[PDB]
Amino acid sequence: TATFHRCAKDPWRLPGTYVVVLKEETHLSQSERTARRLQAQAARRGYLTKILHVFHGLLPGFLVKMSGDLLELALKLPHVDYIEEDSSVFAQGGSLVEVYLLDTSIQSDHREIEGRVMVTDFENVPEEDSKCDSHGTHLAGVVSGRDAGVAKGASMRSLRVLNCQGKGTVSGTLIGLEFIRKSQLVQPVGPLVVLLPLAGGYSRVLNAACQRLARAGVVLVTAAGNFRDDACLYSPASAPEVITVGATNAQDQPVTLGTLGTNFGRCVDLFAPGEDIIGASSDCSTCFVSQSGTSQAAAHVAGIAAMMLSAEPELTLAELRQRLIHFSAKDVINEAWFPEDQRVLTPNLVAALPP
């Protein structure tokens, strides 16, 4: 039977908005019929409701703004798999390959990335509680930047899912992922790499969407998270078929970020450089700045993967994973920085291009 889920990080919860996920083979007409049913049954009980979005492509279901009072009712609807309360996520060669970036707005005319980044018209961000585009612009530059990029031949498409403070929603991220899959079906191109340099609490729906996208043949790279914690407790970091990237520094140390730092554990696939990373600064068209985080590390791995996929376009996801591991530097990271029980579980791998 159908279950209800909400973010375990209580300050990250977004009460009043729910993702109703329907069973796997449900098609659009049914999803719409189920949404209209909910509204009608709700209205019968005096409750106002608004359908914000109907999903199809990866997940069948819909986004509804309504009172949580209606959850028991909604969970008895036909075709419902589960319902998840929305919650927040936060900012943390290559020529045949398209790299999608879901992040903040970007400065596309920055000389480092000018002409290699295409701003899609997709935008889904929550209202706030040069600066708006610092995070995305730096990460675009890490992937494909002319002077400081990993994969200079890669072309990028950017979607905006984080606001000016680097905050987005799970629901907004889902709609962004759906938009990527939709665009692909409409106009197929080569291998896709989807970069998700963000993280929220463990999300069943976000992990499921990522898993479906991966099963459909798309490569997903994510930030492990900057909480000095087990990456399995965060999403999309914990989605298994995603490539989850932790951050190391020039001394082969896991990265310290204030009192926190890189996440670790069995959900991390490998590490990459993620401290003191020079890259495009959106302050001016030729400006550069150094930044740190698992976002930057993920961006390195998206660039390596783009180069690898351009060289070997037939690689399956599992084969791409084997290459990333095979080509990594091994056992260079200081394991003593990790909690004692996590040292064996945390792969001692720093990503590298093949020579």
């Binding site: 400081a148 990993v150 020039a250 990459a272 450089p273 003191d276 990373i277 020079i278 390195h300 390596i304 720093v350 990503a351 590298a352 291009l353 093949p354 020579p355």
Partner: peptide, 9 residues
Amino acid sequence: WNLVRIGLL
């Protein structure tokens, strides 16, 4: 340091 680390130079 990062581009050298990943073997780009």
